[PDB]
Design an enzyme around this catalytic site. Sequence first.
Site, PDB file in Angstrom:
ATOM      1  N   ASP B   8       0.846  -1.197   0.000  1.00 57.15           N
ATOM      2  CA  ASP B   8       0.000   0.000   0.000  1.00 57.15           C
ATOM      3  C   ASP B   8       0.894   1.264   0.000  1.00 57.15           C
ATOM      4  OD1 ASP B   8      -2.171   1.851   0.221  1.00 57.15           O
ATOM      5  OD2 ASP B   8      -2.799   1.061   2.131  1.00 57.15           O
ATOM      6  N   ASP B  10      -0.202   4.803   1.462  1.00 53.75           N
ATOM      7  CA  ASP B  10      -0.332   5.339   2.843  1.00 53.75           C
ATOM      8  C   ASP B  10       0.075   4.355   3.965  1.00 53.75           C
ATOM      9  OD1 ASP B  10      -0.954   7.975   3.683  1.00 53.75           O
ATOM     10  OD2 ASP B  10      -2.729   7.137   4.684  1.00 53.75           O
ATOM     11  N   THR B 122      -3.552   0.953  -3.923  1.00 48.03           N
ATOM     12  CA  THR B 122      -3.886   2.001  -2.987  1.00 48.03           C
ATOM     13  C   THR B 122      -5.266   2.576  -3.187  1.00 48.03           C
ATOM     14  OG1 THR B 122      -3.122   4.164  -2.118  1.00 48.03           O
ATOM     15  CG2 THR B 122      -2.815   3.793  -4.443  1.00 48.03           C
ATOM     16  N   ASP B 184      -1.390  -1.360   6.269  1.00 53.82           N
ATOM     17  CA  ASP B 184      -1.381  -0.993   7.702  1.00 53.82           C
ATOM     18  C   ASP B 184      -2.818  -1.039   8.323  1.00 53.82           C
ATOM     19  OD1 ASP B 184      -2.340   1.288   6.347  1.00 53.82           O
ATOM     20  OD2 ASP B 184      -1.427   2.686   7.706  1.00 53.82           O
ATOM     21  N   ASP B 334      36.613  13.917 -18.114  1.00 59.76           N
ATOM     22  CA  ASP B 334      37.617  13.547 -19.047  1.00 59.76           C
ATOM     23  C   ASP B 334      37.645  14.540 -20.228  1.00 59.76           C
ATOM     24  OD1 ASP B 334      39.723  11.364 -19.856  1.00 59.76           O
ATOM     25  OD2 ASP B 334      38.369  11.436 -21.631  1.00 59.76           O
ATOM     26  N   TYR B 382      50.395   7.247 -23.817  1.00 57.62           N
ATOM     27  CA  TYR B 382      49.342   6.655 -24.675  1.00 57.62           C
ATOM     28  C   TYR B 382      48.760   7.740 -25.648  1.00 57.62           C
ATOM     29  CZ  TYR B 382      45.736   9.232 -22.371  1.00 57.62           C
ATOM     30  OH  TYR B 382      44.942  10.230 -21.929  1.00 57.62           O
ATOM     31  N   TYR B 465      41.768  13.482 -29.654  1.00 55.97           N
ATOM     32  CA  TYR B 465      43.155  13.561 -29.172  1.00 55.97           C
ATOM     33  C   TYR B 465      44.077  14.067 -30.279  1.00 55.97           C
ATOM     34  CZ  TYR B 465      42.795  10.822 -24.728  1.00 55.97           C
ATOM     35  OH  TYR B 465      42.634  10.434 -23.403  1.00 55.97           O
ATOM     36  N   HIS B 523      39.788   6.374 -12.624  1.00 63.24           N
ATOM     37  CA  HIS B 523      39.404   7.159 -13.781  1.00 63.24           C
ATOM     38  C   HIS B 523      37.897   7.214 -14.156  1.00 63.24           C
ATOM     39  CE1 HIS B 523      39.791   9.688 -17.271  1.00 63.24           C
ATOM     40  NE2 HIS B 523      39.038   8.822 -17.934  1.00 63.24           N
TER      41      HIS B 523
HETATM   42  C1  3C5 Z   1      42.361   9.921 -20.177  1.00 59.08           C
HETATM   43  N1  3C5 Z   1      41.348   9.921 -21.239  1.00 59.08           N
HETATM   44  C2  3C5 Z   1      40.652   8.615 -21.262  1.00 59.08           C
HETATM   45  C3  3C5 Z   1      41.529   7.381 -21.257  1.00 59.08           C
HETATM   46  C4  3C5 Z   1      42.223   6.981 -22.376  1.00 59.08           C
HETATM   47  C5  3C5 Z   1      43.019   5.837 -22.366  1.00 59.08           C
HETATM   48  C6  3C5 Z   1      43.133   5.103 -21.196  1.00 59.08           C
HETATM   49  C7  3C5 Z   1      42.461   5.492 -20.049  1.00 59.08           C
HETATM   50  C8  3C5 Z   1      42.612   4.713 -18.824  1.00 59.08           C
HETATM   51  C9  3C5 Z   1      42.684   3.337 -18.850  1.00 59.08           C
HETATM   52  C10 3C5 Z   1      42.895   2.612 -17.692  1.00 59.08           C
HETATM   53  C11 3C5 Z   1      43.076   3.303 -16.511  1.00 59.08           C
HETATM   54  N2  3C5 Z   1      43.004   4.641 -16.429  1.00 59.08           N
HETATM   55  C12 3C5 Z   1      42.759   5.313 -17.577  1.00 59.08           C
HETATM   56  C13 3C5 Z   1      41.659   6.638 -20.096  1.00 59.08           C
HETATM   57 MG    MG Z   2      -3.124   2.431   4.325  1.00 61.61          MG
END
Ligand code: 3C5
Ligand code: MG
Lengths: 546, 546
Positions: B8, B10, B122, B184, B334, B382, B465, B523
Site C-alpha cells: 500500500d 499510505d 492504494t 497498515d 575527461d 598513450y 586527441y 578514472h
Molecule cells: C584519459 N582519457 C581517457 C583514457 C584513455 C586511455 C586510457 C584510459 C585509462 C585506462 C585505464 C586506466 N586509467 C585510464 C583513459
Molecule cells: Mg493504508
Amino acid sequence: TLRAAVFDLDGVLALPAVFGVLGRTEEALALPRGLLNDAFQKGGPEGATTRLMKGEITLSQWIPLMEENCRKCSETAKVCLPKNFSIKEIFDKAISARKINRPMLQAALMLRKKGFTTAILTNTWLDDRAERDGLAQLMCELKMHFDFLIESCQVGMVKPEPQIYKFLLDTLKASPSEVVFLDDIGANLKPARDLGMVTILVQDTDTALKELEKVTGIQLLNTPAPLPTSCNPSDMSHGYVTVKPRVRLHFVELGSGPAVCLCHGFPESWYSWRYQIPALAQAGYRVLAMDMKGYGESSAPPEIEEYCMEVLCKEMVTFLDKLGLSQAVFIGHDWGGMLVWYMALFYPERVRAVASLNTPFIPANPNMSPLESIKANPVFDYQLYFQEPGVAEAELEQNLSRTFKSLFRASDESVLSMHKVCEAGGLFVNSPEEPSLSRMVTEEEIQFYVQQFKKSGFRGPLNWYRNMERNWKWACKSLGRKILIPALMVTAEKDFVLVPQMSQHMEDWIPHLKRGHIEDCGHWTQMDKPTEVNQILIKWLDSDAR
Amino acid sequence: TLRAAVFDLDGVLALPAVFGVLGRTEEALALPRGLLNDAFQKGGPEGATTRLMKGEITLSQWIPLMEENCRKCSETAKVCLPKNFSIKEIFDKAISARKINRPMLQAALMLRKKGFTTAILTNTWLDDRAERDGLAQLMCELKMHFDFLIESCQVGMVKPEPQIYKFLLDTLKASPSEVVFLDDIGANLKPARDLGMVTILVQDTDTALKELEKVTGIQLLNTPAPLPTSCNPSDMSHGYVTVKPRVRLHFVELGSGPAVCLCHGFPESWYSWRYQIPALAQAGYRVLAMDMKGYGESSAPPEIEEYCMEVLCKEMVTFLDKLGLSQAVFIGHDWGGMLVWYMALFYPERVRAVASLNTPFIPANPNMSPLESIKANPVFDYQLYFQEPGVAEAELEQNLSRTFKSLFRASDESVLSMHKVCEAGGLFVNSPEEPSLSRMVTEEEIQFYVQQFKKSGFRGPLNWYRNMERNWKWACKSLGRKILIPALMVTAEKDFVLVPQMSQHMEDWIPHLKRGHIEDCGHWTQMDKPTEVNQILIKWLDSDAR
Ligand SMILES: CNCc1cccc(-c2cccnc2)c1
Ligand SMILES: [Mg+2]
Ligand SMILES: CNCc1cccc(-c2cccnc2)c1
Ligand SMILES: [Mg+2]
C-alpha cells in the site's frame, strides 16, 4: 546591385544603446560632461575597453579597470565621483534596459525574405556577470533571424579596424559594393565606406529605414504586420519516447521554463503549431509539440481501440513519466482538445492547466447513445462517413496534396460543405481536382503535410473517430466531477463544425473557466489567426500557468 | 512459492500516513477523540469519502463534504470546532508531510531484483488542489520502481471490496498463494487473507520487514547500501538536433528545472551518466546527457579538425540555440571536462555554471608546444600512441568487448599500465584476451557500449586527441581571462592519468572554484563511485546553479 545587409547591435538592432548610459549617467549625476566617456575610451587601442572588445579579458575583469579609469579622469578634471557610484550597477541597468528595436529587426527580416544575406557585426564582450543570462536571451532571440553574427570578442578584431571589414566581406562571400552597412557611430562606417559599401548612419530608426528603403528599392516602412516566426522542421530538436512496446511518440521541443504540451487535431501534425512554438518558447515556456498517436513520426498501429481516449490519455501520462515530468500544461485543438479535457478529468495531478482551441467540453449524456447524438447534428454527418474502415482512407489517401489543400482553408475560401457527406458519397465529391492554394498555407507547407502522411496514411488518424461508444462509456465514469484546475476555452467564430455556441454551457462543469474568442477564424485556428492565438495563449499562460 | 509482493502507499511505502492526521489533529486541537475519523468515514460505502476513493468526485469537490461531515459529528457529540478549523489546510499539510518510506521502498526494489512481480495497490483520490504537484512528484518517484500501480480512483473499486483483490490477482497473472500483501489496515488485509494470500499487518516498518524477510526467505533488513537508480536506454526520451549539415547530436533527456548538460569522456557514451541521470532529475534538474560528437547515435565525420575544441564548443552553442536554451549548467568528465572549461572561457553567457570530474583546468603554455608538454609526462605516452591515424583504431576496434572490459576497471583491478605504450606497441599488448568483468560493470552494460561503438568505431573518438596544436592555438587567445562563473572541480584520488595534484593551481585562474574529492576512485568516476558523485553534484547544483 545590393545583396547583403549588415546591422550593428547597440543603437541599431537594440535600444537604448548601452554606450549611451555614460551620457545619461553624467547628466543624472551632474558629472563633468564626457567624464564617463573619457574613462570608457581611456588608452584607446591599448586601453581596457579595447582588450574587452577583442575578447582578451571578460566583462567582470574589465569592471574594476573602468572604475580605475573613472577615478583617473575625475582627478585630472579636479572633481569627485558620488558616494556609491557603481560601474557594475550602471552597466547591469543599461544592459537590461536595452531591447530589440522591433522595426529595425522587421526590416532585416523583410530584406532577408527578399533574398538579402543579413548579418550582425558588433563590438561586444564576453559576459560573465551574475546577470549575463539577460544578454544571452537577447542574442538568442536576434541571431536566429540572421545569416551571420560576427562578434568582436569572438574574432579578436574590433570596428573600426580595417581587418574586421575584410573579415565581414569574406564571411558574406560578397564584394563591398553589394553591401549596405548600418551603424550609429560614424567612425565605424568610414572603413566600410572606404571599401565602397553603402553605409547608413543610424540616429532615429525611421530615417535610417527611409535611407535603407531608398537604397535597396524594397518597401520597409509602413509595411503590413508580418506573421509570427514559423519553424523549420530540420532546425528543431526532435524527441522520441517509447510509451509501450509498439508505441513510440515523436515531438518537437523548444524553450525552457514550465512544460507546455501541444496536442494537434485531425488530420494534422506537430507542424500545425509552427507559429505557436517559437512564440511560446520566447515567452518563457518549454514547448513539447507532439505528433499525436497515428501521425507523422509517431507510431500508427492499425487497431481501432488503440485510439480510444482512455488508451491515448494513459499513453500521454506515460509520456510525461518517461520524460520525468510531474506535470505539463496541456493545450489541444480539435481531437487534441478533446484529449486535454479528458486529461484534466482523469489525471488532474499531471495537468498544470488545460486549454482547448475550438473543441468544447460537453459531458457525456448517459441516456443517449453517442452515435444517435451524432446523427442529431447535420454538420457531424462526415463523422458517420468516417466510421466504416477503409472508405474514408481510400478517399483521403488518393491524392494527398488535394486532400490537404481542400481541408486547410480560411473561412472565406471554402470548397467543402460538410453537408450530407454520406449521401454525397464522400468528402471531396464536389470539390475541384486541383484546389487553389489557401492564403493560409504555402505550397511548401502543404508538401510537408503530404510527406508526413505518406508514412502511415489515414487509418490511425480516422481511428480517433472510431471509438465513440468506448469513449462515451469511459466519459460516463466522470459525470460526477468538475474541472477545477485552471482552464481556457478558445472559440473560433467561423468554425462551422465546432461552433462557438456548442461551448455555452461549459461553466456548469468548469465554473472558473477563462475564455478567448477569435473573430473571422475558421476551423484551422493556429494557422488561420496565429497572431491572435499566440497573444491569447501567452496572456492566459502567464496569468494562470505561472 | 511467493512470486509477488503488493504494497500500500499510505502507511506502508509512504509515511506519516495521511489517514493519521485526523488523530494528530484531534489531539493537537483537544477535540473529542475520533471526531475527525467519524466525519471522514461518515456514510461508509455510500458516504463522501468512498465516492472520492472510487474516482466519482475529485479531492476539491470532497473537501466541503468532509467539512459538512465535521460539523454534523461535532453537533451530535455536543462540541464546537475551533475558529479557523480548515480541512483544506489540514490535508495540504498532511499530504506534503508524507514522504517515501525509504527502507520499505528498498525492500520492494530488492524483491523485484530477485524476480518478484511488485505492485502498489492504494485507495487514493483524484487530486485537483492548487498543490497537487507534490503528490504527482511522489507518485512519479515511487511508481517507476514497481510492475503495476493500481489506484482505487482509476479502477472504480476500493479496498476492502472483494472485486479490487480479484482485479489485483488478474493484473498480477498470479494465484493468491503466490502473493504477499502488506497493509497498515487490518480490515484491508482480511479479503486478501480469505483468498489465501500471505498478508502482513504493517505497524512499525522494521517488524513488517522481518515478517517479509521470513516469509519470502530473502534478506531485506541490514542489507548493504544499494547503487543509485540506473537508466534503461529504451525507457529514455531520445533527442536529436542537427547542428550543421552533416552533424546531428543525440542526447537523452529526463527531468524539469534548470538545464544540465552532461558531457562524457573518451571512449564513452551518454550511458556513462546512467547513475547520475535519474538522481539529478529527481533533485529538480532537466538533464541532457549527450552522445558527444563521434559517439553513439551522434554523427561521426572522419576528418580530424571536426574534433578540435573550437569546433566542438561552437557546435554545443548551436545545440543550445536550436533547443531554445539561453544557458545550461555544463558538467564534463575527461574530454568532456576539457570541453566544459572551454565553454566557460569562450561562452560564459551560455554557461549557467561549470563542473569537471577529473579533468583539471590548466592554461595553455604559450612558450611550449603542446606535443612537448605531452612528451614530458610519462603517463600521457598513450596520447602519442593515439596520434597516428589508424593505429589505435585497429587495436581498439579489434575486439570491442575486450576493449571496454580492459578500460573500465576500478582502481584495485587494473590490467593496463599506461606505461610506455608506444614502445609496447599498444594499449592492450600485455592485457589478457578475456579480462574478468569489473565489479563496476555488468556484462549487459559492457554489451551496450560494444553495440554503440559498432556504429562508428574509434576514429571520431580518437580524433578528439588529434587536435593538440589546434586546441593550444585557440586556448592561447584566452590566457588573459579568468573563469568567474560558478565552477566545481572534482578530483579522483586513484585516477593515475588525470591525477588530483594536476588541479592544484586552478584557483589562480578560477579564484572562487569549489571542490569535491573522491577517495578510492579511479578514472571512470561516475561508474566507480556513483553515490558519491551524485551527492557532490546535487549539493553543488543546489547551492551554486540555483
Ligand atoms: C584519459 N582519457 C581517457 C583514457 C584513455 C586511455 C586510457 C584510459 C585509462 C585506462 C585505464 C586506466 N586509467 C585510464 C583513459
Ligand atoms: Mg493504508
Ligand atoms: C472536426 N475535426 C476535424 C475535421 C474533419 C473533417 C473536416 C473538417 C473541416 C473541413 C473543412 C472545414 N471545416 C472543417 C475538420
Ligand atoms: Mg553601435
